[PDB]
Design a protein around this nucleic acid. Structure first.
Ligand SMILES: [Mg+2]
Ligand SMILES: [Mg+2]
Ligand SMILES: [Mg+2]
Ligand SMILES: [Mg+2]
Ligand SMILES: [Mg+2]
Ligand SMILES: [Mg+2]
Ligand SMILES: [Mg+2]
Ligand SMILES: [Mg+2]
Ligand SMILES: [Mg+2]
Lengths: 103, 56, 110, 117, 140
RNA sequence: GUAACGGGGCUAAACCAUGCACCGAAGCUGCGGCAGCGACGCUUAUGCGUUGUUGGGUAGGGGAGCGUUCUGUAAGCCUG
RNA sequence: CCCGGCGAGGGGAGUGAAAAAGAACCUGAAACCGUGUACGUACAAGCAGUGGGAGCACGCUUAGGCGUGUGACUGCGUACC
């Protein structure tokens, strides 16, 4: 079954796919707590019942896996006028992985 | 008729294209199993078959 | 040196001579002429001379009389280019580089 | 007491001269390129990356308008159906569903067609 | 990795058969021009070589909207100076739909090379079904 | 040389009225980050997290720095 | 010692730590000129790039959708002082 949701960008195109996302809040480390997503589900969309909504009955969510929420990425990114140069700068996030069970 | 900035490299190296040389390709003729030059019979004696220039 | 000969200066530009060289490689040797003697471009008269000098070095530096050989290598390099001036439109369009090369012919075993 | 410019002289020219692409003629070989061209590159670049965000959007909708309409309701009506929802709003970009999950997409056009009051 | 699906050099070609005996005339060109590129197509990244394969039938059944049945500049000037210019109204040319009218797609394509690859390569005809001088095989 | 819709092309793809929907900017919102000021939470030279807000602008003013040659720290450290 | 005009020039051998120090001789850059290879290229218009981008040549990895080169096609789009 397909997947779908927003939370910091509509990043939920792939089915299970185990792709990065955002970050918990208080801390990242792994393990889990079993967080169902929400019925943003495309009805899961995947079977003889691909549905315009996504809304194909109440409650429909996948549990978050919490594969690996760390790493960063580094990108210089520096501006400069004709008399200055903020050239010196850096801002990143860790985007927790998450594998996501089945729809 | 003056010029102003001109790129020695690349450019010119392009006009040189129409400047490469060429190849001939010709025979030997019955008698000379080699030379014959171009569309000539043979220079060795300058004869196509006999008394032409100098021969037997 | 595995019997060479090469050149230096004389003057005949690189590409000019680099063209005729491509004509001869691989078999060569027994091709001291014909694939060269039957092509007239200045570059040709120059590669042949050194060609023979090279194939001649086969009776001095090494044995293997002239008949086998291969000529597995032939490459020309850019040699110091002479500079001169050229009266033109008051003196702007004048550089003239004579250019020159060599040939560096080789003759090893197949 | 030695400027001896030679010392950074080289490094600077070499720096900008480092335009791999070579571009064309003087655009690499001559220092003239740098602030003339290497500078243009910086300018043309400055605007294109940020102006691009839309050039793709224009494509995204260009295909949605080309996919969703074939099965009833134009792009104009589409997002309007979609517009009505409590949670149902997943934007475009992934909107390219029309290329891989056609069934999803056409199952998504009803989410709007049947949705339009 | 670098996202862009390659150019399998016009990978697949889906055959089709329009009718043209319809009533849309000029409107049809677009969905006829979009098609030979990458309209219904999703993947096969256009811009590069590509296309499809459809075909027109009679087409002789067109009227356009307004009095276009009577207009349409149409001239095919030639490299002849001497004052040429061959203007013929649409109805005057509709007598034999040739490289024009039905061929209203040409002016709608990328033009020049490659776009030129699709060009008339869709076939036209003017009689629908009878002796389809065109490929009889698979079509829709 | 079409050249008095940008072109196509339009009988409505014009206009008038009515209403809904959609596209659309660096505008606003969302998310992250930077800096100044007022506050808030506290901590409390102080400072940091939350928050409200301010950050278009050549001449020109102010404030921070790099990298280079030379001097100290250096017959110390690095090196055939 | 060998090619050559008892040329020029070079190729070996030997000197040397090195001759990739040979007298044009330290290091030897740039313009500029060539040979070789990968790709593009002979129906296509313009500051030659930039944004998108397929293919091809190699390189990827126990696929995982990538790195290097080249760049068809396409939106833009008149150098610097
Ligand atoms: Mg002479
Ligand atoms: Mg002058
Ligand atoms: Mg200096
Ligand atoms: Mg795209
Ligand atoms: Mg917007
Ligand atoms: Mg600073
Ligand atoms: Mg090739
Ligand atoms: Mg790399
Ligand atoms: Mg001009």
């Amino acid at each position: 079954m397909y997947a779908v949701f927003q939370s910091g960008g509509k990043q939920h195109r792939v089915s299970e796919g185990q792709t990065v996302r955002l970050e918990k809040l208080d801390i990242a480390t792994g393990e889990t707590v079993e967080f169902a997503e929400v019925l943003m589900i495309a009805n899961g969309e995947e079977v003889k019942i691909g549905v315009p909504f996504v809304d194909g009955g109440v409650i429909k969510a996948e549990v978050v896996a919490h594969g690996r929420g760390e790493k960063v990425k580094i990108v210089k990114f520096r501006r400069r006028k004709h008399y200055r140069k903020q050239q010196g700068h850096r801002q990143w996030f860790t985007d927790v992985k998450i594998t996501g069970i089945s729809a | 008729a003056v010029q102003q900035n001109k790129p020695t490299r690349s450019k010119r190296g392009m006009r040189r294209s129409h400047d490469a040389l060429t190849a001939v390709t010709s025979l030997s003729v019955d008698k000379t199993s080699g030379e014959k030059h171009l569309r000539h019979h043979i220079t060795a004696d300058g004869y196509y078959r006999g008394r032409k220039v100098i021969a037997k | 040196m595995e019997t060479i000969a090469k050149h230096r200066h004389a003057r005949s530009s690189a590409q000019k001579v680099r063209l005729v060289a491509d004509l001869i490689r691989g078999k060569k040797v027994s091709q001291a002429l014909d694939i060269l003697t039957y092509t007239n471009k200045k570059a040709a008269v120059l590669v042949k001379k050194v060609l023979e000098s090279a194939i001649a070095n086969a009776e001095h530096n090494d044995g293997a009389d002239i008949d086998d050989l291969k000529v597995t290598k032939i490459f020309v390099d850019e040699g110091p280019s002479m500079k001169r001036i050229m009266p033109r439109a008051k003196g702007r369009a004048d550089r003239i580089l004579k250019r020159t090369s060599h040939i560096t012919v080789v003759v090893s075993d197949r | 007491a030695r400027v001896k410019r030679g010392v950074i002289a080289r490094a600077r020219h070499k720096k900008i001269l480092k335009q791999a692409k070579g571009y064309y003629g003087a655009r690499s070989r001559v220092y003239r390129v740098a602030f003339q061209a290497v500078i243009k590159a910086g300018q043309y670049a400055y605007r294109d990356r940020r102006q691009r965000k839309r050039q793709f959007r224009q494509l995204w909708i260009a295909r949605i308008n080309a996919a969703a309409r074939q099965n009833g309701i134009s792009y104009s009506k589409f997002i309007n159906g979609l517009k009505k929802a409590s949670v149902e709003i997943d934007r475009k970009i992934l909107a390219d569903i029309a290329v891989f999950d056609k069934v999803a997409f056409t199952a998504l056009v009803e989410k709007a067609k049947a949705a339009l009051a | 990795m670098k996202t862009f699906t390659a150019k399998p050099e016009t990978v697949k070609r889906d055959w089709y058969v329009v009718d043209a005996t319809g009533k849309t005339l000029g409107r049809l060109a677009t969905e006829l021009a979009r098609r030979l590129r990458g309209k219904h197509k999703a993947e096969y990244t256009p811009h590069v070589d590509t296309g499809d394969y459809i075909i027109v039938l009679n087409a002789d059944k067109v009227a356009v909207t307004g009095n276009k049945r009577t207009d349409k500049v149409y001239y095919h000037h030639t490299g002849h100076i001497g004052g040429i210019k061959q203007a013929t109204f649409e109805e005057m040319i509709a007598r034999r739909p040739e490289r024009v009218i039905e061929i209203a797609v040409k002016g709608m394509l990328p033009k020049g090379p490659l776009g030129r690859a699709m060009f008339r390569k869709l076939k036209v005809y003017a009689g629908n079904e009878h002796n389809h001088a065109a490929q009889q095989p698979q079509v829709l």
